[PDB]
């Protein structure tokens, strides 16, 4: 039906409310077939009238074609800044700004851009808003700062400092998980410090928790938070000794997750005590066993990690270094031997 | 609710009502006077 | 001699009639082109360039130096007709190029400036024209190491050219020299800001002076209060352009320096506050109050060229902190830099005079030497200093030249600002040009009018469109195109569904000025303004019920909701509103006895402040129309016996009115007969009424039985003129009758 | 344009006071086509064709629709 429909609404498309051509848009695109030649009409009619219409409308509109077509949601965002910025200055109730801010968040982290101004108004309600932010809604702003490269120091050791290590009955179960992760990738992002102490009591609360794969990005900071924190290396020995390994060692759930575990894991240096050994070895054993050429992403990955090893002269177990080389020559023979 | 408005202008006296209409003349059954025998 | 008109037209200045006819002086042959491009630059803005200067310069094109360049784009990018669009494409930005490595780069800056103008309301050597310059800037700033200079490349490559590409090697050089004075810290600031531009490591090097000079100023305070203006100044330009930047790390900074100010206000310079008051109104600061103006009432005398800008700009901004005190002192301090030398931006004295009219009738008359001041170096104006003095000049009388100054630039700035500034403009303008409501504010609205139906698809909002209508419509400027083209592009699905009790009033005023109604789309107001009726501020009743009584439109249920609600409110409209609400219903010939017996007792009670009798006659007599009895309570009596206690201004028409309404109702009060009576005589004792009305007023008396014969007498050759029907006779018959009789 | 504008279309949208519903070529059309006017300038916006093609349809117009519902003496017929 909507296929057949669907050449006529080209030539009524000029004509709808916004209020409606929401809808229009989620049904369209609830069923993947909604195609780029409506959508650019609605966007026009909406960007040509963003002096009077509703702010709700807006902030739909651009959300709900942000997966697919983000110019088109960037470029609706861009006609209602300002306003939105003045309504989210001026305005008094909690739940509504909240809201707001939650939304606008999410829009500007799912289409990875964000303009100056709405940012910095963001930033100033979230901190007048620190006391009705669930741990969800201090996840969600700060990863909206991320995937964006904007800096707010401010902003950054504030929401640090008040996120306290306040977790649910102190045994949080996913609620501050994702949130520990958007945490330490944003501070590992924008390096600094003082967070030591809150650094370490999230590790040790999360890795009880931390059974997802997530844990292995947030190896990642870590080593990447190394160069300028010395205090986080035992959180990185409890990351590096957590049950959640402990079971990752005997199946590799993710391939990618191996590949990025096994650099952190090298950076780290972590390839001289005989329990890094009996985790490197099943790892390496697997990435030879493993069927097929490398993805991109990781042959780039495992052609990182084998020069890291080989720079790394510290690999004297001579079972290791053959698997070493047994990988070298898996990589050749898919980038050619 | 702006410009004074506890002071209207004074209407001029050269103002008659007019009326706009579309699509009275136009349409293919009214379009050519017709006869009949 | 156009060198001299160009040369001052580029500072901004305004024209004389004069100029204009001295630099037409024929304007033929035997002079060089550059002189044809400028005469076509100054002839742009003062409407469309001549067909003889087109085809001359058309025709005698063959080199054209880079001040002709620059001359011609800026004919091209200001001419409203187009007409140089054509021979446009045979020098398309000089694609021969010759231009570059051969000119100086102050013109480069004017072509950059010149290219910032908006433009008009094919493309793709403006395209080439804007690389070729980009990589002309980049090898000419590569080679130079002067803060300056390339602070002011920035300034001119500020417009839309390229992808930030060369101001991020800007900052990275900046950056890499290493060097940052707080004179150079502060410019690179201002570099930053003009190009709204975002670097981290500038950013980085930048914050240790600024906290310096902070914890200097800080320091400045009491204790080591050795004082020196440079620090202050600097410090005040500094929290200046962060009060508008409002970069994210510059915060703590300004935080502190405002805690210091506000709990240690003594003996602080008279110039931070200025600038400081205008970061607080920034970051919604309400602790200014009772800082500024506080401390500073009469002592401004003592502030520099610079602050009396920053302080203006504040004033405009939140009226809370404008006083009578503190305006008049302005206006005086202005006046006073004025009177010396080293004059203020015209932008300073434009906002000092919108302060002054804002305030209206509490003080007196803004000086004769301000409105001079202004109306010289009119175009060196920013578009919302225009619209500012637009907006006020309605809000205080005794203005009258500054207004019809102000209608004479609006055909001239029809391209160099947004619709909502054209139709706030046109509103403003609405309430001082109609007491004018001269011949020469005709052509200029006229010209407006055409314009505005031309482009009338870029208007997309209902209340910007109902404000211009509104503001055509209180311009005596009836006509056809303008309401027929915008009763249709407001009829729109999306441009309709928008409008709130606003943009419908206004609308629906402007339409029943004129006599345009429109069927459907008076249907559709009828039906929203009945679903949401009960929600109607006042002065918007009286707005739609003059506008929908005019088009004569009979409908029962509306006319009721509207009557009713009118009712409802009574104490805020005052008399003339009254007076006009009660002939609108009056006109058609509707009834409501409630609108009538709640309104004629706000009337009766406020009668001592009606200009005369005629007006009471007047009410009357609508009252009389809406078939209200009017032998009814003494409200009606005492209109009556006010207009007989002072009835000599009544005129011919309010005696034939008051005397038909006699006639009609049976009135046997006999005072106010006696009364027309006399007054009868008296204006027939000086040949200053009309056989008619003597007529009416021996109707009456003869019907009531009063014998008056002192006005049967002289009345009566006026009377039997009109009544007795003559036949006319030959002169044989008239000789007959005189052998007759 | 093209064909489907006539004089007969012209007409009734003039006579129901709808001029501006055309699009600016179809006006220049009629007028270097019908009207015949000498050359038109391809840069004049809506007024200017709309006020010219309706003054020339005034001016071409002699055909009285008006029939006088009143005596009046003086007028000298044969019929």
């Given at each position: ?34 195609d ?79 303009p ?21 809604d ?12 904007y ?46 102490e ?18 292995a990005?947030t ?86 990690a ?28 898919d980038?050619?031997? | ?7 209207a ?29 | ?67 002709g ?66 990589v ?29 590409e ?143 800008g ?5 004033l ?57 001041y ?17 907006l ?90 303008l309401?027929?083209?915008f ?99 009056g ?102 009424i009309?056989?008619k ?49 | 344009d ?45 007024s ?24 009046n ?7």
């Open positions: 039906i909507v296929g057949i429909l669907l050449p006529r609404l080209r030539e009524v498309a000029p004509e709808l409310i916004a209020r409606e051509a929401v809808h229009i848009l989620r049904l369209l695109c609830s069923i993947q077939m909604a780029a030649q409506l959508v650019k009409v609605v966007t026009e009619t909406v960007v040509a009238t963003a002096a009077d219409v509703p702010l709700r409308d807006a902030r739909q509109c651009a959300f709900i074609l942000s997966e697919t077509f983000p110019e088109e949601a960037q470029r609706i965002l861009g006609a209602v800044e300002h306003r939105l910025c003045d309504d989210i200055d001026m305005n008094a109730d909690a739940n509504e700004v909240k809201t707001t801010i939650l939304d606008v968040c999410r829009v500007v982290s799912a289409t990875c851009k964000g100056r101004r709405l940012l910095n108004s963001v930033a100033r309600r979230s901190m007048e808003l620190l006391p009705q932010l669930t741990p969800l201090v996840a969600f702003v700060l990863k909206a700062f991320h995937l964006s490269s800096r707010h120091l401010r902003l950054l050791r504030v929401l640090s400092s008040s996120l306290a290590a306040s977790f649910p009955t102190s045994n949080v179960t996913k609620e501050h998980g994702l949130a520990a992760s958007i945490v330490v990738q944003s501070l590992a992002h924008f390096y600094l410090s003082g967070c030591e809150v650094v370490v009591t999230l590790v040790n609360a999360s890795v009880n928790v931390l059974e997802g794969l997530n844990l990005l190896l990642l900071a870590c080593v990447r938070l190394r160069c300028v924190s010395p205090g986080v290396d035992p959180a990185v020995d409890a990351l590096c000794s957590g049950a959640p390994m402990r079971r990752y060692v005997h199946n590799a759930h993710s391939m990618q997750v191996t590949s990025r575990i096994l650099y952190g894991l090298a950076h780290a240096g972590r390839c001289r005590s005989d329990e890094e050994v009996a985790i490197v070895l099943p790892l390496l054993k697997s990435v030879v066993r493993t069927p097929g050429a490398l993805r991109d992403d990781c042959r780039g990955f495992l052609l990182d084998v020069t890291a090893l080989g720079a790394d002269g510290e690999c004297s177990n001579d079972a290791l270094q053959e698997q070493v080389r047994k990988v070298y020559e898996r990589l050749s023979q980038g050619g031997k | 609710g702006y410009g004074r408005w506890n002071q202008s004074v209407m001029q006296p050269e103002t008659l009502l007019d009326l706009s209409q579309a699509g009275f003349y136009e349409g293919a059954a009214n379009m050519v006077p017709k006869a009949f025998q | 001699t156009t060198s001299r008109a160009y040369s001052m037209l580029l500072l901004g200045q305004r024209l004389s009639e004069d100029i204009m006819f001295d630099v037409v002086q024929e304007q033929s042959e035997t002079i060089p082109v550059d002189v044809a491009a400028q005469a076509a630059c100054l002839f742009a803005e003062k409407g469309d360039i001549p067909e003889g200067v087109i085809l001359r310069l058309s025709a005698e094109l063959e080199h054209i130096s880079p001040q360049v620059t001359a011609f784009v800026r004919a091209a990018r200001r001419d409203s007709s187009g007409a140089l669009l054509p021979h446009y494409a045979a020098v398309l930005n000089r694609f021969t190029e010759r231009d570059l490595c051969d000119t100086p780069l102050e013109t480069l800056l004017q072509m950059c400036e010149v290219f910032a103008l908006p433009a008009p309301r094919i493309n793709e050597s403006q395209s080439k024209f804007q690389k070729a310059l980009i002309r800037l980049f090898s000419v700033i590569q080679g130079s190491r002067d803060v300056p200079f390339l602070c002011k490349v920035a300034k001119a490559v500020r417009a839309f050219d390229a992808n930030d060369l101001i991020q090697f800007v900052c990275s050089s900046i950056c890499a020299q290493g060097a940052l004075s707080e004179c150079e810290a502060l410019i690179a600031f201002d570099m930053i800001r003009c190009c709204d531009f975002v670097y981290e490591p500038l950013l980085d090097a930048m914050e240790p002076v600024f906290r310096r000079l902070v914890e200097s100023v800080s320091a400045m305070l009491e204790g080591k209060s050795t004082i020196n203006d440079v620090e202050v100044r600097r410090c005040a330009c500094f929290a200046t352009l962060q009060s508008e930047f409002d970069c994210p790390d510059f915060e703590t900074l300004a935080s502190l320096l405002v805690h210091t100010v506000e709990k240690n206000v003594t003996g602080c310079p008279v110039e931070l506050i200025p600038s400081v008051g205008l970061l607080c109104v920034r970051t919604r600061r309400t602790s200014a109050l009772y800082i500024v103006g506080n401390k500073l009432e009469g002592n401004m005398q003592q502030l520099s060229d610079d602050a009396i920053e302080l203006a700009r504040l405009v901004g939140t009226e809370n902190l404008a006083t009578k005190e503190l305006a008049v002192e302005f206006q005086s301090v202005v006046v006073s830099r004025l009177l010396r030398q080293q004059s203020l931006p015209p932008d300073v004295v434009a906002l000092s005079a919108v302060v002054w009219l804002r305030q209206g009738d509490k003080v007196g008359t803004i000086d004769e030497r301000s409105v001079d202004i109306i010289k170096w009119m175009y060196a104006i920013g578009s919302s200093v225009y619209t500012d003095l637009c006020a000049v309605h809000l205080s009388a005794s203005v009258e030249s500054l207004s019809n100054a102000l209608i004479d630039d609006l055909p001239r700035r029809l391209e160099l600002l947004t619709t909502n500034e054209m139709a706030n403009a046109i509103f403003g303008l609405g309430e001082v040009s109609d007491m004018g409501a001269r011949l020469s504010h005709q052509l200029v609205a006229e010209r407006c009018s055409d314009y505005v139906v031309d482009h009338s698809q870029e208007f997309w909002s209902g209340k910007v469109i109902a404000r211009l209508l509104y503001g055509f419509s209180r311009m005596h400027c009836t006509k056809r195109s309401y027929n083209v009763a249709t592009r407001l009829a729109h699905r999306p441009v309709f569904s928008l409008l709130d009790q606003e943009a419908i009033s206004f609308a629906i005023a402007a339409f029943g000025r004129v006599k345009y109604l429109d069927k459907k789309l008076f249907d559709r107001f009828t039906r929203w303004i009945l679903d949401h009726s009960k929600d109607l501020n006042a002065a918007e009743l009286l707005l739609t019920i003059r506008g929908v009584s005019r088009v004569m439109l009979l409908n029962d249920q509306l006319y009721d909701d509207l009557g009713s609600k009118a009712a409802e409110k009574v104490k805020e409209f005052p008399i003339e509103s009254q007076c006009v609400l009660l002939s609108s219903f006109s058609l010939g509707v009834e409501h006895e409630r609108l009538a017996s709640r309104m004629v007792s706000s009337i009766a009670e406020n009668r001592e402040e009606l200009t005369d009798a005629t007006k009471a006659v007047d009410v009357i007599t609508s009252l009389w129309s809406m078939n209200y009895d009017v032998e009814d309570d003494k409200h009606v009596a005492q209109l009556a016996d006010w207009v007989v206690q002072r009835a000599e201004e009544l005129t011919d028409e309010s005696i034939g009115k008051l005397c038909l309404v006699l006639s009609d109702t049976n009135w046997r009060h006999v005072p106010l007969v006696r009364a027309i009576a006399e007054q009868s005589v008296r204006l027939q004792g000086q040949q200053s009309s056989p009305c003597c007529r009416e007023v021996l109707d009456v008396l003869g019907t009531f039985m009063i014998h008056h014969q002192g006005a049967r007498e002289n009345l009566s050759a006026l009377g039997r003129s009109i009544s007795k029907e003559r036949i006319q006779l030959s002169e044989e018959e008239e000789q007959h009758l005189q052998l007759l009789l | 093209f064909s489907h504008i006539t004089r007969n279309t012209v007409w009734g949208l003039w006579n129901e006071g709808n001029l501006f519903s055309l699009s600016v070529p179809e006006l220049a059309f009629f007028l270097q086509e019908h009207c015949r006017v000498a050359n038109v300038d391809p840069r004049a916006k809506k200017a064709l709309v006020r010219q093609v309706e003054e020339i349809l005034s001016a071409e117009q002699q055909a009285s629709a008006t029939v006088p519902q009143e005596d003496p003086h007028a000298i017929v044969v019929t």
